[PDB]
Amino acid sequence: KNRAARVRVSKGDKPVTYEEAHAPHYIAHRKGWLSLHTGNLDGEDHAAERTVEDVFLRKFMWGTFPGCLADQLVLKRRGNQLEICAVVLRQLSPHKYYFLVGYSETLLSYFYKCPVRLHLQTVPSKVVYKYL
Template identity: 50%
Template sequence: MLHKALVTPVLCPKVAPALFLSRQFHISPVCNKVQAARYKITPKRDRPLTYEMANPPHFIAHRKGWNSLNVSSLEGGIRPAETVTEDIFIRKFMIGTFHSLVCSEVIIKRQHNHIRIAVILRQGITARKMYFLIGYTEELLSYWLQCPVTLEIQTIADRKEVIFKYI
């Protein structure tokens, strides 16, 4: 049998009020308003949005696709951190190479060791320069990433063609 002094703790009367006052539980009302990745409506409703931008995040895989298709983030996947870093590098390289020509999101698709990059570009330069930049981009990315890279490019005449709605 245990001794009664060991079971019940003895608190000094001077310490007990301070102990109880310091342990408080605060709650706040639930806020179900989701604001992440949503664009604010302008007073004149003159902000253009593409289809990707017009759909909120909870419509990913329903009405809009993923911007990066890979399986490295699944359990047992190899190189998840390197894949994300490479995707960021590819996007920045594409936007820098095709300066002021990129009209949509840069979509990266990985299949085995092959990377396909899909993008919509504006026809702002001559066809000769466009073909040079495509070859230049594919060659450099293939060398840096150590795997074959293919660009899937669609061109449009004007940037307004990708506008889905104004908010």
Template identity: 45%
Template structure:
């Protein structure tokens, strides 16, 4: 009889502590608290080129910038508004950008010195690139017209190419790592 009385007292104490804990948890949950901390562990290794042993790997200005500097010292490679809220065609725009880049690499073989920058302004698509001066000016103008006409026919919107030329790859090298 003494053990059952002691067990019932312990059970009643346990239930009262559980009830008090529940009330405390409910009181904590009913308050709206925001906890913010600074990002202490950024992933800064992804997207960075590896340093070579002899430090003879050339980098352009855009390649030498770290990924977390996008929007500060480095710009986006595609400028469009399809990723805004309630905007359509985001997947089509991404596929078209990939197609434009592959078309440029195939049309201008071994002449692209930098990445292809694509800017979309309303219906106009502006493509910017730095090209090597391997070919004569007449051939370069032909390739420019060919690229604009073919892409405008395929994408069904006006295309404008902004090309800058350099004589040598050394002209676009920013630093060696």
């Protein structure tokens, strides 16, 4: 039996989001890619450095906003710009969100030497696609 990135049926009480409810064979049929850059296009360079950056950014944001992220990040690259789109929860105070946005945007711009923006979308609770 295949295992890769499959949430397995339980007793019908496990809430899954739309992203985690779709197995890998749907990545270009029902769900899209969580990162969009040019590295993996034909004749394009630096796929390796883009990949390492994505892995770091996903871990940095998970620990920088502990318990706030409601779903996976969407990493966007346009030219020199890096745009991080995060769906967060409405539990942490707004003051603390603004502090962390100013802190993460500055710290990441100096680390990867590019203009970095963080776009937060707040949800009251995790969006449940189905109960498995």
